[PDB]
Design an enzyme around this catalytic site. Structure first.
Site, PDB file in Angstrom:
ATOM      1  N   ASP A  35     -54.910  10.719  10.654  1.00  0.00           N
ATOM      2  CA  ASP A  35     -56.090  11.548  10.469  1.00  0.00           C
ATOM      3  C   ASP A  35     -56.576  12.113  11.798  1.00  0.00           C
ATOM      4  OD1 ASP A  35     -58.428  12.709   9.675  1.00  0.00           O
ATOM      5  OD2 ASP A  35     -59.502  10.828   9.268  1.00  0.00           O
ATOM      6  N   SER A 199     -60.011  30.242  15.271  1.00  0.00           N
ATOM      7  CA  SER A 199     -59.067  31.184  14.702  1.00  0.00           C
ATOM      8  C   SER A 199     -59.560  32.612  14.942  1.00  0.00           C
ATOM      9  CB  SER A 199     -58.896  30.902  13.203  1.00  0.00           C
ATOM     10  OG  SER A 199     -58.118  31.887  12.550  1.00  0.00           O
TER      11      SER A 199
END
EC number: 3.4.23.22
Length: 330
Positions: A35, A199
């Site tokens: 994770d 992004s």
């Protein structure tokens, strides 16, 4: 040194991925959920409340000659999905894919929430976010990667998750045969303890690319792709009959649909998520309403590039002095 381990979807939907991890001496192999959005290595154990264990493999520290109780240390964690666990702490030898760390903090669960009990395939979590998020008190502990880093050939790990198929976690090297083209690297903020990046935009299907900054985290422990409501609405508008269902808890779509791809930007590069990666199947057995793999982050407080996004790429988690993230197509 290096390590390399195969990671395997837990079910036919790729709801999560499990990777075998050797703990203790002799080794006890548990299947952990790696994770990159958390920083605790915790396991089902011989200390876990018996009624909260249902099929998981447990770590028994008393059977490990290298286990030592970390005196006075406790831990307690809550995840973004509302699940939680807590317990005490041992140090022990932990190996992943041939890479060994001695003195790793292994957090033994005394209590786990229902979601964990109900998932027989996940024996615990191995956190790969920054150690500043580790919950051990009163002395915070380091992640497996943080402990291994100085010994690695290069201070990196890579995630290569499969679509409906196994994939690979590598530590200490970049497998140049595992991706196509080049890896595009992008800046990371560690201010919140995550692999947080920005992004450069998105496209839906064959549509034009929208240049827009989307801050979010690369999180292998989250199943879906959570993005701003504007972006998510633009995606689902291209699927006839798709709608946001408050009762179900997100966007659903007719199972008869053909889903468009979704592209996200990494600098000037582009990662394409095929439409089929966005199908999470019937909302309940036999339903013709299917659950979407792109959902709104509104009210999470952060955008999350979970497995839906990451499995479309070869992803480098670069833990150099100034960390960065790399993405390549594959």
């Amino acid at each position: 040194s290096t390590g390399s381990a195969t990671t395997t979807p837990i079910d036919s939907l790729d709801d999560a991925y499990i990777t075998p991890v050797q703990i203790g001496t002799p080794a006890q192999t548990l299947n952990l959920d790696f994770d990159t959005g958390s920083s605790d290595l915790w396991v089902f154990s011989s200390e876990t409340t018996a009624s909260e264990v249902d099929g998981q493999t447990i770590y028994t520290p008393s059977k490990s000659t290298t286990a030592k109780l970390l005196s006075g240390a406790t831990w307690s964690i809550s995840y973004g999905d509302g699940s939680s666990s807590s317990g005490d702490v041992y140090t022990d030898t932990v190996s992943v894919g041939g890479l060994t760390v001695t003195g790793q903090a292994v957090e033994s669960a005394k209590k786990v929430s229902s979601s964990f009990t109900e998932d027989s395939t996940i024996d615990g979590l191995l956190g790969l976010a920054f150690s500043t998020l580790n919950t051990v008190s009163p002395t915070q502990q380091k992640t497996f990667f943080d402990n291994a880093k100085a010994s690695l050939d290069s201070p990196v790990f890579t995630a290569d998750l499969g679509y409906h198929a196994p994939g690979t976690y590598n530590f200490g090297f970049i497998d140049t045969t595992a991706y196509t083209g080049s890896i595009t690297y992008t800046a990371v903020s560690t201010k919140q303890g995550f692999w947080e990046w920005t992004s450069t935009g998105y496209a839906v299907g064959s549509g034009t690319f929208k240049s827009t900054s989307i801050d979010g985290i690369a999180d292998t422990g989250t199943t879906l792709l959570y993005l701003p409501a504007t972006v998510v609405s633009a995606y689902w508008a291209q699927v006839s009959g798709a709608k946001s269902s408050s009762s179900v808890g997100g966007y659903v779509f007719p199972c008869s649909a053909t889903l468009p791809s979704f592209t996200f930007g990494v600098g000037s590069a582009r990662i394409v998520i095929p439409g089929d990666y966005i199908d999470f199947g019937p909302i309940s057995t036999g339903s013709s309403s299917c659950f979407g793999g792109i959902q709104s982050s509104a009210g999470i407080g952060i955008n999350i590039f979970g497995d839906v996004a990451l499995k479309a790429a070869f992803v480098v988690f670069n833990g150099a002095t100034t960390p960065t993230l790399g993405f390549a197509s594959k």
